[PDB]
Swiss-Prot record, chains A, B:
Keyword Transferase (UniProt): yes
Keyword flag Transferase: yes
Keywords: Transferase
Species for this entry: Enterobacteria phage T4 (Bacteriophage T4)
GO molecular function: deoxycytidylate 5-hydroxymethyltransferase activity
InterPro entries named among the record's database cross-references: Deoxycytidylate_hydroxyMease, Thymidate_synth/dCMP_Mease_dom, Thymidate_synth/dCMP_Mease_sf
Protein name per its UniProtKB record: Deoxycytidylate 5-hydroxymethyltransferase
Catalyses which reaction(s): dCMP + (6R)-5,10-methylene-5,6,7,8-tetrahydrofolate + H2O = 5-hydroxymethyl-dCMP + (6S)-5,6,7,8-tetrahydrofolate
Family listed: Belongs to the thymidylate synthase family.
EC annotation from Swiss-Prot or TrEMBL: 2.1.2.8
Catalytic-site annotation from UniProt: 148
Length: 246, 246
């Protein structure tokens, strides 16, 4: 429950235990990962491991606001991971701004906003990112992009808007930090939009609960887990790192 | 995480505490509910409160296997709740057999089966019940049926198939017990289908993790919570009940 879920610090602990026990899972690409399966925690920090990168997150936000399904429209030089997963025409699925703001995904943000505006206690206030046809759309034109966020539900209780984020898959290092920033953005916008609609509502942002089928770290980031395991420091540069994982 | 989520017995405790503290939420129909928001627990029992009803569950299973979107096709006299939520033509959305077996919902079961058959470690093995167009489809032709199950993801680790059930809304009393029976059915079928595909796999059913945006009890069932709170008995007939909630 929202009231006492796991914290991010406890998520760190369990990832550390998974690495120390060598609880390894081979990836779709043949690499090792460690995982929490069925993860569920309150996102009480904006990152788990790694450094801040407000600048990349702002670029991704602008790409989301454009709703463009083409990775080249990401501001500046598009990251290599986006180039790799895109189709032969540069197209993807996981533009989250498209997911919640495009008419072609059935106006998720606006309909959730309207639902909660008419019934503050509604259990039907939700933004549905993925879609049944994703079973076939994830590799359209040779892309490799099976939507990672399934749904985000918004529940207003005691004048706080809580977000229940349901993801099938989330990378602990870049993924969570970028996706948290996005979900906090949408939550704050929804609070502001509802408050602007009626001054008697007086809502504030509540808790963001993170639910992930596979919350994982790739072997290329094991050094971050190991360094935190040994020192409590959530970040170290790869150059400075001294330890087992290169 | 799968390893130590809440148990059903702890879910009972928290619902009991919600009732004792009069933590009430008014329903879409003007009635009271108590809730766990962002519930996440291992379904280590097949019910929370209430009596067994294997016979109703078997009728619902047959209706799911028919994939019929019409409530009259439920075997026997269709329950009043199904008649109430159906459209002017008797139609609904939430036939879960349609959701996972119909071609019109993009072959969720078969595609999840194929995905896990080719990549046992896949994070993309999922059955997507709801859909973005649900923002408009939930009241087609005057029905009132916004799909309650969003997604169910299947993760095979250490030869155990775990199910991560993501629901926006679940009634503790009839809902959870019926829906648990269904999700356990699908999980066992998926295990059997994968094992029948290759005798080296040797999978077994793992844990079913239940994630619910609003896991709630309606006031008409508060007596069950209260009786359990006072006695530890998970069921009492309404006739036998003596206490505050009629």
């Amino acid at each position: 429950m929202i009231s006492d879920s796991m914290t991010v610090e406890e998520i760190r602990l369990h990832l550390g235990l998974a690495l120390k026990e060598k609880d390894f899972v081979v990836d779709k690409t043949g690499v090792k990962t460690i995982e929490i399966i069925g993860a569920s925690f309150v996102a009480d920090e904006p990152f788990i491991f790694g450094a801040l990168n407000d600048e990349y997150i702002q670029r991704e936000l602008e790409w989301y606001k454009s709703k463009s399904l083409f990775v080249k429209d990401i501001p500046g030089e598009t990251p290599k991971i986006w180039q790799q997963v895109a189709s032969s025409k540069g197209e993807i699925n996981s533009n989250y701004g498209w997911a919640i703001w495009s008419e072609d995904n059935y106006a998720q943000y606006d309909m959730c906003l309207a639902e909660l505006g008419q019934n503050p206690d509604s259990r039907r206030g939700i933004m549905i990112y993925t879609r049944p046809s994703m079973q076939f759309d994830y590799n359209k034109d040779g892309m490799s992009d099976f939507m990672c966020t399934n749904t985000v539900q918004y529940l207003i209780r005691d004048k706080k808007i809580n977000a229940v984020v349901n993801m099938r898959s989330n990378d602990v290092v870049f993924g969570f930090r970028n996706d948290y920033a996005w979900q906090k953005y949408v939550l704050d916008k929804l609070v502001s939009d509802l408050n602007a609609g009626d001054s008697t509502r007086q809502y504030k942002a509540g808790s963001i609960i993170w639910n992930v089928g596979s919350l994982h770290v790739y072997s290329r980031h094991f050094y971050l887990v190991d360094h935190w395991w040994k020192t409590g420091e959530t970040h170290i540069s790869k150059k400075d790192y001294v330890g087992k994982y290169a």
